[PDB]
Amino acid sequence: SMNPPPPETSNPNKPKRQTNQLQYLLRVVLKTLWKHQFAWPFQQPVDAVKLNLPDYYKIIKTPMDMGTIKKRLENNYYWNAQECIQDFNTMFTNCYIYNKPGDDIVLMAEALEKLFLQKINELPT
Q1: What are the φ and ψ backbone dihedral angles of 78, each rounded to 5 degrees?
Q2: What's the CATH fold of domain 19-123?
Q3: What is the rounded CA–CA span in Å between residue 115 and residue 111?
Q4: C-alpha span between 87 and 22 (Å, rounded)
Q5: Where are the domains of the chain?
Q6: In the chain, count of helices (H) and strands (E)?
Q7: CA end-to-end distance (rounded Å), the chain
Q8: Which is nearest to 46 in space by CA: 31, 59, 30?
Q9: SS (H, E, C) 91-120
């Protein structure tokens, strides 16, 4: 029922890059999803205490959220675009795992994921 430490956003010994694809992931992908009307549940780690979801972190063992992704991008945490794309997909998958089809939160994730897919379809070479 308690919250775990959040995913790390800083690790000085992890090697880092600022590739054109990573810049696109921040300036296009993250920015588009972050401003969406349905972004709010995904803008920070799930607070299982405040939301009264005592089983959330029993089921979700690789938590991820756009607040974490935003900090990772702004902090140049990643080596490549695939790492960041994986974080987005982990976020969506966690939502679908924990919740039920048709739940409001699932419809919200689906809308954000549709935009995600549209933007990553134009990921620059």
Answers
A1: -95, 155
A2: Histone Acetyltransferase; Chain A (1.20.920)
A3: 7
A4: 13
A5: 19-123
A6: 6, 0
A7: 44
A8: 59
A9: HHHHHHHHCCCCCHHHHHHHHHHHHHHHHH
Q: Packing angle between helix 104-120 and helix 81-98, nearest 10 degrees? A: 160
Residue 18 burial (C-beta neighbours within 10 Å; 0-12, 13-18, 19+): exposed
Method of determination?
X-ray
How far apart (Å, rounded) are the C-alpha atoms in residues 7 and 101? 26
Quote the tokens at residue 72. Answer: 């990772």
**How far is residue 110's CA from residue 125's CA, in Å, rounded to a whole number?**
26
Phi, psi of 15 (to 5 degrees): -70, 150
Residues 6+ apart with CB under 8 A from 115: 32, 33, 36
- The whole-angstrom separation of Cα 105 and Cα 56 is 14
